[PDB]
Design a protein around this ligand. Structure first.
Ligand SMILES: [Zn+2]
Lengths: 199, 85, 49, 62, 76
RNA sequence: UAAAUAUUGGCGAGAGACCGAUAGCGAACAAGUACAGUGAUGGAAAGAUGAAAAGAACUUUGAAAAGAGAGUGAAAAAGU
RNA sequence: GGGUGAAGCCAGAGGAAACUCUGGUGGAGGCUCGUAGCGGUUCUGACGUGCAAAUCGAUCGUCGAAUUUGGGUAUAGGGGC
RNA sequence: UGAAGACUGAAGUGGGGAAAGGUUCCACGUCAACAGCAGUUGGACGUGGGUUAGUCGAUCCUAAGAGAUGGGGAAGCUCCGUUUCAAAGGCCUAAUUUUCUAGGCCACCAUCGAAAGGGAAUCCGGUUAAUAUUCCGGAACCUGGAUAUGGAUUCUUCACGGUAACGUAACUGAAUGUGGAGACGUCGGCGCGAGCCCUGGGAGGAGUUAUCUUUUCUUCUUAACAGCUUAUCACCCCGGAAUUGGUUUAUCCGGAGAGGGGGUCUUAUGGCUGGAAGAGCCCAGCCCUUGUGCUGGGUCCGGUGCGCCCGCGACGGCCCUUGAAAAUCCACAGGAAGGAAUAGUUUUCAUGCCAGGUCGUACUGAUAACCGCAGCAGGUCUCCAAGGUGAACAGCCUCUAGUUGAUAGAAUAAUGUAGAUAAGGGAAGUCGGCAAAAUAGAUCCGUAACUUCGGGAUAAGGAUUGGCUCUAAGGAUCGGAAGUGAGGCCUUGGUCAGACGCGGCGUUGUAGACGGCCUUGGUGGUCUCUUGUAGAUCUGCAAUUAACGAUCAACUUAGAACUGGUACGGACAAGGGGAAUCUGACUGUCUAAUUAAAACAUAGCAUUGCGAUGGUCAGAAAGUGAUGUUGACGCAAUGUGAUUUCUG
RNA sequence: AACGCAGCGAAUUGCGAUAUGUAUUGUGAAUUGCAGAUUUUCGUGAAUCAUCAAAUCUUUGAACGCACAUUGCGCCCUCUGGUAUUCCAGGGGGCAUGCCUGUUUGAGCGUCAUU
């Protein structure tokens, strides 16, 4: 509920007891019920299998990647997102990795990652239309919706507000070295206005 | 209808009776009294209200132990009993 | 209110017995300045808790 | 023709407070508070109802 | 209440938890083939009260006499 | 580490060029009482028949309350 | 309680073919007329030492969802929402 | 108190509850004050009486939350945190047969939170001035204790049966693990059942009667619980499908084995028997100071449905929404340990014994018991719900039940308040068609610019509607004319019981009706005749499709004639319409008691910051927090405001 | 702080199921609105008297078995009932937290000597 990702619940054995422990995995697009999954160093390269970054070739695709070893997941958990492996290092166990925003990062070689793209892709494509559809999205998340424009408010309630005409008055580009209360607008902006093509 | 129509909806209780002070001023949502401050260690007294102490302080009650102490002090805290002549 | 507690019912038990007029033989006592009961309660006029 | 009342104080028509009207040997129409239905026992592996086993709410078949 | 059978009725009397037994007369008329008598032998003690239906008045009279003298035969 | 020094609280005694029931403590009386507020809190009015109740038996008008007479007492121009 | 009749299915007619028309079935929608419910447009009507420290009437808006409401629980004064 | 008029009209002036009040409920006495008139009456005043539970609630479990402990802050009042950088325990069996000691397994963790969520088990009839699922009578059921009788099981043993789905009255099972129930949204139609409504025949009672009506109204009911039967959905065996079949209102399914033939199971729901006619209701008749009874009768057999309202079932649409948790109870895997024959195991089954604490339980629930200074046209959460009109829980009129309460009397001036109508004209009135008028239901005809092709649209604009007598179309159940041997009525022959009633003091005498079984022939058309009548009311040898016959039953839709002071959605109920301009796209929201809009919100569009040692934000401080049960199709911070079209 | 107690009290004044008080001591005949006794009245004794050194002290509260809008729910020792080490009820006695002094069981290759 309130998550762009269908989960998956896998049953593993306890090596030291006669018992079973279930773990909640994020399902990559390709999984199905009544399927085997192989997690470890010696595990093979298929969709669903969990491998450490060191035992994987260059140009592979993964998700639910750990920042450290033992983090239990962090990078690339959202819908239709995936991390690509670029480089390798023998000295210093540290692979090179590209994150879905664009900014690359060096991660340890023993860190994990589930193979394949995250399921439920193409969620953002359809428009919501009626406002009631947007209500039900935020109804099962937080209380962050019906946002009033700050310029429409009184000068007490917000900095932009006040005046006979609805205008801002002073520059919306606000510094990094500011304080809480002032920061309403574009915080530490390099560019402004309409950007063309290249991000 | 801020006046008389809204007064029609009043049929709840923010306060109930208290164990310690015996007064209808025990907040249920907060789990604490406004008058005495139950359940805490102390009695909720304030110097800014002199009348608050005057209503509840020693002398008002029965004093069913302290009432007989001045009599015991004067005689010198005795033990045993009187005999006869 | 039908489904009431024992601590509430104990207070209302007192309110029954205390609400009664002044007995006549007290008025013939020596010194005595009392005539009628001041502490008296009717259900319509004044409320309890 | 002949109207009916509740029995167990609780006035609101919730689950575990529903009424089947019934004719008595006296003649008057009166209410009786119907118990909730028991779903069937089901399989472990598949999601199929299990045959040759009674319904009953969990306590009735102790 | 349970029912009858016959037999078992005779074995129920051997308990002597069941002490007394009332009888009832109810005139019926099966589509006026015969307007007949019927009787009903009820046995109390303890969880259940048992009852046997006997239609023929002849068969009832043989059974009514055959029980012990000490057995309390109530009526109506 | 006693004494000479403090004290609008507590227990026990003395006094006054102080107030005299709209005064003096909020309170001379069943006063932190009756009553108001969800609640912290707010907060009144109310003393005096006569020495002794001897608090008006009995008649008569009235459905009754009371009234006219009578009677008590120094006085009822003292009737709760 | 009515009105409108979207996808999905069934049958027919036309045509050399590509396909195009007609009739049923079905019951979609922050659709629509309107009762209870919730609101409060106009009469600048009634009342205006009132029935009422905000009510009374007629006329009106919306009426299957960004709906209406009980009990429990959270947020407290330069603070909350 | 009687009689007559009235109203609310079952979304109520009806019958019950929740919050809240707290004796207002009920009886006897009685009117100084209060009930803005009065008072013999009273929710007033004085004095008493009244609330009975193993099963109804609370108690118990958890929810959003609250909150000790170990720790770390703070001069301190106390703040953070709830599984943490804690040595955090309580559950079973013997040993020993002093009743104290020995076996063991297993292990991130207080406690409060719902009288609408979860949840062990009770119904009918009677009784009081006032109480009842709570007392009385009669019939059940659960949980926790004890325990012995019967049955079952046992020479190889912890039962046998069926191809199978599965069955039977019972039919060992520790540590440990696994699974199910508890456990879950909404709109739509179709099907099944309950209750009410409607209606036929009889068996009673009341009403009407100048005249008419085999009629107007009312009574004919059956609880929990026990037993045997009954189902859509699933599922098993047999057998092998394109000329593709089966099939729903709704198009789904089949070599992963359809249709067809034969089976098994859940018991929701109905049917019969017990409960249980002894009860309740409805008549008729006896006494009787009271209390009361006491004695006869009857309580029966059906039909119909787009009916109303509730529940259950199999199905189909919705979503960037997929619609609680825990206590609690059961099952399976697993084989620990323990057992026999001269005897032993079983208390998941049949019967039988004992016990069931504490607190709440009256009445009102509002134009008079609650809040509003008060007996204030205000406000305040729910359940049951009849007949007619009609699309209808609309409006108008009745039945059951409940009120007949809101200071009264006499005249009918002006000016008011609420309702009304008006010759000729038709907005000339006025800031402004404000206010009021006209239109309105159904069926058939007919329908423009413009358009995001979905709409505009009930566009505009015409015609018709009564009463009475007829005609037409639309269904469901059941039946084929002849060729023998065998199982309704009547009779023939065999074969077997045998009902009740009465009289002398349980007994002894005594008439004595009738019932089924087994089995040969005869029994609508026809003839004999002036004429017929009873029941067409079990297997053989094997003719047939629209060419049909019977029997019962709804309400819809068309068409025709006749008829009237041309009236007919006759009361009630019910859109005025058209051509433009400014403005916001739309549905939605706010100034509680002067501003409902062009303001706010919105989908869509764009910009900015952030890769966790991070962004935004809290806190006096912390070994402290929110976003975050999060990770760029995400979180945070702003502007603009659907679509088409552009943004120098 | 609540709830109770007088022969007839609602409040105030007293007291706690031994409830307008009991025992002990002193004074020496009352209390009094109306009852009623008790004869205690040459006394080991009236009394709403004074006095006060022995006891009782409901449910609570710093409030202490865990909770507490609940007269909620448990555990241990002990005697008596119902057949009873284990279940049901009844009478009696107990179970909070921090800190100090000692006692008894213990934990740690923290560490010393002996086989
Ligand atoms: Zn307090």
């Amino acid at each position: 509920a309130g998550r762009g990702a269908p989960l998956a619940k896998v049953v593993f054995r306890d090596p030291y007891k006669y018992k079973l422990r279930e773990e909640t995995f994020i399902a990559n697009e390709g999984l199905h019920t009544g399927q085997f999954i192989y997690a470890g160093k010696k595990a093979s390269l298929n969709v669903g299998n969990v491998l450490p970054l060191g035992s994987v070739p260059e140009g592979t695709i993964i998700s639910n990647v750990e920042e450290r070893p033992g983090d239990r997941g962090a990078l690339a958990r959202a819908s239709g997102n995936y991390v690509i492996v670029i480089g390798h290092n023998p000295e210093d166990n540290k692979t090179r990795v590209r994150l879905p925003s664009g900014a690359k990062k060096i991660i340890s070689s023993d860190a994990r990652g589930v193979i394949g793209v995250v399921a439920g892709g193409g969620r953002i494509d359809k428009p919501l239309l009626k406002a009631g559809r947007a209500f039900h999205k935020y109804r099962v998340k937080r209380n962050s919706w019906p946002k009033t424009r700050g310029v429409a408010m009184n000068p007490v309630d917000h900095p932009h507000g006040g005046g006979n005409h609805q205008h801002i008055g002073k520059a919306s580009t606000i510094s990094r070295g500011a304080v809480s209360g002032q920061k309403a607008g574009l915080i530490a902006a390099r560019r402004t206005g309409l950007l063309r093509g290249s991000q | 209808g801020k006046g008389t129509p809204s007064f029609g909806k009043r049929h709840n209780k923010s306060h109930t009776l208290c164990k310690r002070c015996g007064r209808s001023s025990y907040h249920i949502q907060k789990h604490t009294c406004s008058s005495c401050g139950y359940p805490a260690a102390k009695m909720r007294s304030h110097n800014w209200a002199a009348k608050a102490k005057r209503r509840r302080t020693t002398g008002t009650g029965r004093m069913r132990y302290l009432k007989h102490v001045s009599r015991r002090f004067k005689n010198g805290f005795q033990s045993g009993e009187a005999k006869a002549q | 209110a039908a489904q009431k507690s024992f601590r509430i019912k104990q207070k209302m038990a007192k309110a029954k017995k205390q609400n009664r007029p002044l007995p006549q033989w007290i008025r013939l006592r020596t010194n005595n300045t009392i005539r009628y009961n001041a502490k008296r309660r009717n259900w319509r006029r004044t409320k309890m808790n | 023709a002949q109207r009916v009342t509740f029995r167990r104080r609780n006035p609101y028509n919730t689950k575990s407070n529903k009424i089947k009207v019934v004719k008595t040997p006296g003649g008057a129409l009166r209410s009786q508070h119907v118990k909730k239905l028991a779903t069937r026992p089901k399989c472990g592996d598949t999601g199929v109802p299990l045959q040759g086993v009674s319904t009953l709410r969990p306590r009735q078949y102790a | 209440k349970e029912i009858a059978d016959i037999k078992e009725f005779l074995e129920l009397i051997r308990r002597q938890d069941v002490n007394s037994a009332t009888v009832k007369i109810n005139k019926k008329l099966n589509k006026n083939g015969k307007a007949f008598r019927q009787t009903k032998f009820k046995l109390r003690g303890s969880r259940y009260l048992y009852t046997l239906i006997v239609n023929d008045a002849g068969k009832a009279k043989k059974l009514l006499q055959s029980l012990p003298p000490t057995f309390n035969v109530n009526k109506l």
